Write a protein that binds this ligand. Structure first.
Ligand SMILES: CCCCCCCCCCCCCCCCCC(=O)OC[C@H](COP(=O)([O-])OCC(O)COP(=O)([O-])OC[C@@H](COC(=O)CCCCCCCCCCCCCCCCC)OC(=O)CCCCCCCCCCCCCCCCC)OC(=O)CCCCCCCCCCCCCCCCC
Ligand SMILES: Cc1cc2nc3c(=O)[nH]c(=O)nc-3n(C[C@H](O)[C@H](O)[C@H](O)COP(=O)(O)O)c2cc1C
Ligand code: SF4
Lengths: 56, 215
């Protein structure tokens, strides 16, 4: 937040707690909107043998 | 078979007991043997039934090429019978029951030998390709599964697969064996089973070599 120090002091005194530590407006601290590709592992029954369906 | 009817009149003429003298109980008689592959003198010969394989090769066939220590594997009863290694063929008899004890069976008494200077995977793949060519294909297991096994062996020969597939191939054979109409499916499943059971390390090493060289 680009708020002047006097306004920050006024708001902190009025609320009684330090507002600048935990702001309710989201900033560059959030995750990027473009992400690497995932891999998403397979399940446990993706075996090639000893995987007869009558047993599961 | 030709041999059965051919020996029947001589059995009748000389008596049943004379034929029953040779071989063991429930394995009586004399048998025609073909010895082929890596031997000094490949030949056909009539011999007493329960003759040990080693003396049969060393006597009539002239011995394995390069000596007995050069031997790698032997198929005792033709392509249908599974192969066996040197360790069990050192002291094995040649009849139905003793070969069943070696998990193979006598079959047609067609001995095919392979020394240590050959690709056993290539030979078994050739046998599976032959079975793929010679199946009539009326029933789904033999037709589809034998083509599948032929493809899997062709892929094994160059090591293009991964070890987790080997067990899969085993399973495929068990699906063909006993579910077809005739015994051609059994005779195509057995060689793969024997090759896997006795030389899984060879297949694994070939796969590792392929994976390393192709990266
Ligand atoms: C009381 C007198 C008014 C002074 C005042 O409001 O200054 C606000 C000024 C800014 O405080 P802030 O809201 O925390 O800062 C917001 C950004 O800095 C805002 O910075 P910015 O980059 O958005 O600049 C926008 C700019 C221009 O924005 C505008 O166009 C709106 C101004 C029109 C006003 C009519 O705003 C101004 O400079 C004018 C502020 C009001 C003065 C009239 O606060 C003070 O100077 C302290 C005064 C103490 C009052 C209690
Ligand atoms: C695919 C296949 C091919 C066969 N080819 C022959 C053959 O060429 N000669 C033969 O005597 N038996 C062959 N058999 C086995 C026959 O079933 C067998 O000859 C028949 O049962 C009578 O044989 P026997 O004289 O031992 O009673 C073959 C079996 C299969 C499944
Ligand atoms: S198992 Fe016998 S009947 Fe079935 S497809 Fe093969 S050769 Fe034909």
């Amino acid at each position: 937040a680009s708020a002047t120090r006097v306004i920050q002091l006024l708001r902190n005194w009025a609320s009684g707690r330090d507002l600048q530590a935990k702001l309710q407006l989201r900033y560059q601290e959030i995750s990027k909107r473009t992400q690497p590709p995932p891999k998403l592992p397979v399940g446990p029954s993706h075996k090639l043998s000893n995987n007869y369906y009558c047993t599961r | 078979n030709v041999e059965t009817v051919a020996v029947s009149p001589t059995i009748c003429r000389r008596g049943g007991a004379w034929f029953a003298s040779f071989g063991r109980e429930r394995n009586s008689g004399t048998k025609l043997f073909n010895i082929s592959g890596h031997v000094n003198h490949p030949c056909t010969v009539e011999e007493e039934m329960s003759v040990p394989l080693k003396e049969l090769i060393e006597k009539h066939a002239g011995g394995v090429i390069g000596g007995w220590d050069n031997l790698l594997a032997v198929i005792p009863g033709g392509s249908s019978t599974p192969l066996i290694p040197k360790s069990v063929c050192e002291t094995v008899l040649m009849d139905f029951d003793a070969l069943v004890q070696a998990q193979t069976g006598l079959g047609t008494a067609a001995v095919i030998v392979m020394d240590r200077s050959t690709d056993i995977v290539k030979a078994i793949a050739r046998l599976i390709e032959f079975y793929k060519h010679e199946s009539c294909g009326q029933c789904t297991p033999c037709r589809e599964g034998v083509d599948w096994m032929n493809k899997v062996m062709a892929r094994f020969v160059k090591g293009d697969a991964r070890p987790a597939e080997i067990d899969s191939l085993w399973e495929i054979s068990k699906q063909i064996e006993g579910h077809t109409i005739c015994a051609l499916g059994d005779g195509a499943a057995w060689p793969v089973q024997g090759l896997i059971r006795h030389f899984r390390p060879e297949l694994e090493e070939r796969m590792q070599q392929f994976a390393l060289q192709h990266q």
